[PDB]
Amino acid sequence: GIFKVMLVGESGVGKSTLAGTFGGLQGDSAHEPENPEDTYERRIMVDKEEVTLVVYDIWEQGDAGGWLRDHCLQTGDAFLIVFSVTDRRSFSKVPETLLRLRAGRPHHDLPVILVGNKSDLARSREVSLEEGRHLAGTLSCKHIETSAALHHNTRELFEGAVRQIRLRR
Ligand SMILES: Nc1nc2c(ncn2[C@@H]2O[C@H](COP(=O)(O)OP(=O)(O)O)[C@@H](O)[C@H]2O)c(=O)[nH]1
Numbered sequence: 769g770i771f772k773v774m775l776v777g778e779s780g781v782g783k784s785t786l787a788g789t790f791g792g793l794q795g796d797s798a799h800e801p802e803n804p805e806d807t808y809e810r811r812i813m814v815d816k817e818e819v820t821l822v823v824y825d826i827w828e829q830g831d832a833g834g835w836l837r838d839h840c841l842q843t844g845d846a847f848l849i850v851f852s853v854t855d856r857r858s859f860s861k862v863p864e865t866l867l868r869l870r871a872g873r874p875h876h877d878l879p880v881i882l883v884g885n886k887s888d889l890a891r892s893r894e895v896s897l898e899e900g901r902h903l904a905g906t907l908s909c910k911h912i913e914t915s916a917a918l919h920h921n922t923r924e925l926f927e928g929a930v931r932q933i934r935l936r937r
């Protein structure tokens with residue numbers, strides 16, 4: 769099968785940087801509509817089963833990005849809601865973002881992971897591992913911390929996404 773995994777969240781959290789750690793073949797305007805710019809495709813093996821995974825980084829801020837956020841929600845098989853552990857403001861918006869996704873696909877059970885990125889930036893940390901874990905508990909979803917910069921837990925993130933999807937299948 770083909771799985772479509774969508775990186776979403778506030779600007780600056782590390783969505784594009786996370787996308788780059790997937791190691792996928794990057795799309796472009798020449799391969800629109802199915803592999804546009806800011807998409808990354810790769811065949812991967814998870815738990816002895818291969819899947820073609822397309823990782824999307826098209827969650828654009830502002831009015832001009834509305835149709836892309838809609839396309840993102842309409843077509844995603846799973847959603848990675850990314851905040852930065854160095855940016856409490858991004859963390860604070862996690863529940864609203866999650867509820868918009870859930871409410872926007874009311875007939876579907878949406879596979880989601882809450883991603884606390886920039887875990888390497890110890891000096892700049894504003895949100896704790898514990899806090900992020902607790903909010904995920906509250907919101908009924910899996911939590912993981914990543915350093916997109918160091919590729920720490922990034923294999924686990926994308927493998928986890930595939931697992932999330934398979935467990936509704
Ligand atoms: N130290 C550190 N910096 C990061 C990490 N992820 C992203 N960055 C940096 O944060 C900035 C914003 O990241 P970017 O991927 O463009 O964020 P986006 O707006 O969510 O796409 C860039 O300068 C990245 O290099 C991380 O895990 N650790």
Ligand SMILES: [Mg+2]
Pocket residue numbers: 783784785
């Ligand atoms: Mg970006």
